[PDB]
Every structure is written in C-alpha cells, then in structure tokens.
Structure 1
Amino acid sequence: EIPSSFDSRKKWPRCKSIATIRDQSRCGSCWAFGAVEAMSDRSCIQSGGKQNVELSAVDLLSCCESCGLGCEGGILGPAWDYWVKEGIVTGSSKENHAGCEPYPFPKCEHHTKGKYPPCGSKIYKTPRCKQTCQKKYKTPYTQDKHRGKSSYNVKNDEKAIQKEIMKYGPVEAGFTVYEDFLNYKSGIYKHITGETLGGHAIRIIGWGVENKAPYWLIANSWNEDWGENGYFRIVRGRDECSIESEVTAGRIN
C-alpha cells in the first residue's frame, strides 16, 4: 500500500547522498546531475549502505558520448546505460574537492537571490573527458568506476512511480520547464504563465499532500539557495509538465 507521504531521506538516512543538494553551475548538465545523484542514492540503498559514495557528475558529463551535447543538454536513458556499461567514478562538488573527479565549476545563483555569484546566461564549454583521478586520490580512474546492472524507464503511472521510489530509491525524471518555473520560491509548483524553456532533469525523492493538494518532492541541482533549501514540490497525479512521463532509473543488482 502506498503511504500518503514518503521521503527517501527518512527511509534511508545512513545514505548521505540522498539529502545532498548539488549545483550544476553555468552548464546545462541537469541530465547528468539527476543521474549521478539518483545513482549515488541507489548504490547506497541497494547495497545496504556498503557503497556510500558521491558519484562524479563531470565523469558522466564529459565522457558519455551517447548522452547528447554535454553542457548544452543531454538525454536520460543513455546516461543510465553509461552507468551500467562503463560505470561512473566518484567526485564531490568543486568546493569539497573529494573523490576521483570533483566537479570543475563553482556554485552560482540560478535566477534567484542569495549568497553565490549569479549564474548569468553564459555557459561553460563541456569539460574534456580526462580519465584521471585528482593527484591526492590514490585509486586509478578505471578502478574507481561504480557500475549498475540494469536501467529502465519507469511506467507513466503515478502508483508505479511511487512503488519504484519506495522500493528502489530516488529516480531521475524529466519535465518541461516554462518561464514561471524560474520564479519558483516555495510551494507546490504548476505551470501557470510563460513560454517553454525546454526540458529539465531532476531527482524525485518522495511525495506528500498538503491541504488536499498532492505533490512530488524533488531535488533540483541549483544549490541550496534555490527553492525550498534546494528542493521543490510539483503537482502529482496529472502529468504536470510531463513529470510522470519521463522517469528513468536503474539498479545495481
């Protein structure tokens, strides 16, 4: 039976990645962030906490040739296929500078107020695929790879998505971003004004209901200043902005 609310952070609190918000910086690498975040979560959840790692966004962003255009956007299915076939090494944020390949780009504000420099509208070139761990990290790049066993799209059905998240952990999901999404501060988002800005990719970690209004609970990759401490909520059950139609995940076993 599906509970009225669920929060992956509360079910698997040993897994540090689940409550970590990242920042893609001045790069359209959301496709890679939603992927490595959910893969980090799932690697920990599905291994009973034996894997408790932060997977490298830059490794996937830079090295996956079949995933699209890097900092100019990408494709979800091939990102999970890459994790299954090639694997992804470890790597923290830029400021944390941990793991094999930490992210090269700094935190910035994504169309919102706060303490980081504004992202602005310029975007970085996709980083090179370096295949080399940072000097202090004493495991060779190929030996730091973490691989999945399977990947799949999740059925476009609310209950199927809920069952998948509750059993196997957070999922990656695409949705259509409209201009009013950039004005989001808090609450349960739905598209009301503005034109399309294309597709975004995020990580769905749970769901809930407030004042009878059902929502998905989602981690964005725009740092902790954006939205509700880095998270947002969006209407659930009505395929709002295609949120129930682009879900992808995978398993280590």
Structure 2
Amino acid sequence: EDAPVLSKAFVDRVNRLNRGIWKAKYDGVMQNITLREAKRLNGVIKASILPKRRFTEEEARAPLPSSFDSAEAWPNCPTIPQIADQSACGSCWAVAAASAMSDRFCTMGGVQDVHISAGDLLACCSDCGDGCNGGDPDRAWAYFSSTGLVSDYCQPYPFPHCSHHSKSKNGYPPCSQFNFDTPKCNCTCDDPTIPVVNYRSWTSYALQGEDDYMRELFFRGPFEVAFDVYEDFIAYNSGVYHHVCGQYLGGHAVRLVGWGTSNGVPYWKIANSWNTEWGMDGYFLIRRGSSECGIEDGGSAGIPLAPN
C-alpha cells in the first residue's frame, strides 16, 4: 500500500503488451507513487439523475470533421488550454467539473475569463459525496444549476501544486509530504475585502456514446467524462492509451477537449488534472469508438447563465 505501483519490470511488459501504439515510462514523473497515493487521485464514487441531451434537427445534421480541437475552435477562450492540479486529494469529480464550467462561461456565457472554484464545489456540495474522499460528477452540475458557485478569485483552490518528482522542473514541493481532508464550506470570499459574485447554470444534462461526445463538444465546448483507471495508465507518457495490464485503482473524472486520428487509431484528446509534468504537457490521448475503460458510458454538462 506504501509499496510503489510502478517498476521497470511492469513498464517493460506494458510496452510489449500495448504493441507500441502508446508509450509507458518508469523513470517519468510518477516513478515512486505509492498504491495509496495513486488510489487517492481517483475520486469518482456513484440510471442518471440528469436528462439525456436532445440535439435539434440542425445540430443532428452537422457533418462533424475528422479531427477537432476546442482551443483552435474558440481561440479567444484562455481557460481551455490551462491544466488543473487536484493536488493530494480525491477531488477530480469537482476539479474536472469546475474546469469545463470556466470553459463554458466563454463558449456560451458571455464571459472571456472566469475560473469557477473547484474548492467551493468540493466542500459545499454534500449531496455530491464526501469531498476529497470522492463524489458524483452528475450531482456537481445539478448543484451548479440549483445553488451556484463562486470564482477562484473569491475562493482559491486550498491545496498547492505538488510534484511526484523528488526534484520538480517547476519547483513544486513533493506530494509525499501532503494528505489533505475536505476543506470547510465558506459563504463569503477567503479575503473578506473581495465581494462575492455568484455564478449559476440554467440547465444540466448527460451525454452517452461517441456521437453525443463529438456533437456536444463541437457546438458547446469541453465537458466532464469519467473512466476506470488501471495501474498501466499511471505510467502513460505518449500516444493513444488502451488498458493492457495492472489492477483497478478507481474511477477518475477528466475534461474532454477534442478528437482525431494518429496513424489509423481514432482517439479522444483529454485534459487530466495532475499538472503539466505528467503525460503530454498535462493531456493524454485514449482510444475512441469501443468505450475504452468505460470513457463513453457517461458525460455531464450544462449551460451557464450570463451574469447581471
């Protein structure tokens, strides 16, 4: 449990079972992560309480391109290419939700650059689950509708950037010296001289399957998906992931941003929440079409309401 997840032996058998479609790395940023540390990162816990997306006749007939990138589609939205760090907490369900909400304020909500507070969601939605011990993406978006959230400016994410590297390029403190509990729920801003601006959605819905994902992304931008994390994913470095090896570590929520083809392999482009040192500058590609690790089973999304 305090034993390391990864080994040269493990990674070498992954690089041979995956046939070179993707690349795993032993001596990368997660070389020393413990089973306990890797499990904590995967905080999705709990058919759907949200109605299924209904596309209009016009949405349904759009001929979707062979490849798509949200940052390229909305180049005046600076939150889309930013990468989150959940830190040493099982908060992915809240961090992925808040990231896509920020993005959607720019693609739909008439607001170029607001960061919705992951920390507010994590601490104040007890409906959603148990904070840093995990929660439900679906209920995160229902809370954004029913109650609303404050910005990052009002309540900064309480947990600092940390590295699994013992000597980090960005100089962050090691994640090994940290084990955080659910923060206190606050009504006003951390700095009491900053006034509270409340942000709310008017509707929340669910996406299921490949067509739902591409069509929703194309019209309205990034949203929250979840998948099963296996030990081999922790060592991911490049290319299009598919599970070949290792035990289940839990469910993990991420932000979907695009799709494409790499040498005949169809993929999703995804923003993880483990900072820019991990994977492809914080992104990974995963196989598209076969619900790889269940990634196509359930997305969560909503439409933000323009302020004043």
> Quick check: TM above 0.5?
yes
| Change beyond 3 A, Cα 1:12–1:184 | same
Q: Which residue of 1 aligns with 2:130?
A: 69
Task: Give the root-mean-square deviation of aligned CA atoms.
Answer: 1.7
| Change beyond 3 A, Cα 1:112–1:9 | farther
Q: Given residue 168 of structure 1, which amino acid in structure 2 is its aligned partner? A: R
Shift of 1:110: 4.9
- Unaligned residue ranges in structure 1 (runs of 5+): 92-98
Shift of 1:43: 1.4
- Unaligned residue ranges in structure 2 (runs of 5+): 1-62
Q: Which residue of 1 aligns with 2:207?
A: 154
For the pair 1:59 / 2:115, whether they are aligned, the reply is no
Q: Given residue 67 of structure 1, which amino acid in structure 2 is its aligned partner? A: C
CA distance in 2, matches of 1:207, 1:125: 35
CA distance in 2, matches of 1:183, 1:112: 16
CA distance in 2, matches of 1:60, 1:226: 25
Could you report, residue by residue, the CA deviation over 1:85-120 in whole angstroms, capped at 9, with x for unpaired residues?
A: 1111100xxxxxxx1000111112258984333323
Q: Which residue of 1 aligns with 2:262?
A: 210
| Change beyond 3 A, Cα 1:36–1:235 | same
CA distance in 2, matches of 1:114, 1:234: 26
For the pair 1:22 / 2:78, whether they are aligned, the reply is no
| Change beyond 3 A, Cα 1:112–1:198 | farther
Shift of 1:252: 2.3
Give secondary structure in 2 for the equivalent of 1:149. Answer: strand
> In the alignment, which of 290, 294, 297 is matched to residue 242 of structure 1?
294
Q: Given residue 242 of structure 1, which amino acid in structure 2 is its aligned partner? A: G
Q: Which residue of 2 aligns with 1:108?
A: 162
> In the alignment, which of 220, 235, 240 is matched to residue 168 of structure 1?
220
| Change beyond 3 A, Cα 1:126–1:210 | same
Q: Given residue 173 of structure 2, which amino acid in structure 1 is its aligned partner? A: P
Shift of 1:136: 6.8
| Change beyond 3 A, Cα 1:135–1:172 | same
Q: Which residue of 2 aligns with 1:95?
A: none
- Of residues 110-119 and 8-17 in structure 1, the stretch that sits farther from structure 2 once superposed is 110-119
For the pair 1:132 / 2:188, whether they are aligned, the reply is yes
Shift of 1:51: 4.9
Q: Given residue 304 of structure 2, which amino acid in structure 1 is its aligned partner? A: I
Shift of 1:134: 2.9
Q: Which residue of 2 aligns with 1:96?
A: none
CA distance in 2, matches of 1:201, 1:111: 23
Runs of 4+ in 1 over 4 A off after TM superposition: 110-113
CA distance in 2, matches of 1:102, 1:129: 13
Q: Given residue 102 of structure 2, which amino acid in structure 1 is its aligned partner? A: S
CA distance in 1, matches of 2:289, 2:167: 31
| Change beyond 3 A, Cα 1:21–1:188 | same
For the pair 1:50 / 2:102, whether they are aligned, the reply is no
Q: Which residue of 1 aligns with 2:60?
A: none
CA distance in 1, matches of 2:206, 2:222: 13
CA distance in 1, matches of 2:262, 2:177: 35
Could you state the TM-score of these two structures normalised by the residue count of structure 2? Answer: 0.75
Could you say which structure has the larger radius of gyration?
2
Q: Given residue 276 of structure 2, which amino acid in structure 1 is its aligned partner? A: E
Is the Cα contact below 8 Å between 2:76 and 2:112 reproduced in 1? no
Q: Which residue of 2 aligns with 1:197?
A: 249
Give secondary structure in 2 for the equivalent of 1:185. Answer: strand
Could you report, residue by residue, the CA deviation over 1:189-220 in whole angstroms, capped at 9, with x for unpaired residues?
A: 11111010010000000111110101000000
Is the Cα contact below 8 Å between 1:110 and 1:226 reproduced in 2? no
Q: Which residue of 2 aligns with 1:145?
A: 198
For the pair 1:82 / 2:143, whether they are aligned, the reply is yes
Is the Cα contact below 8 Å between 2:265 and 2:287 reproduced in 1? yes
Give secondary structure in 2 for the equivalent of 1:10. Answer: helix
Is the Cα contact below 8 Å between 2:78 and 2:112 reproduced in 1? no
For the pair 1:227 / 2:279, whether they are aligned, the reply is yes
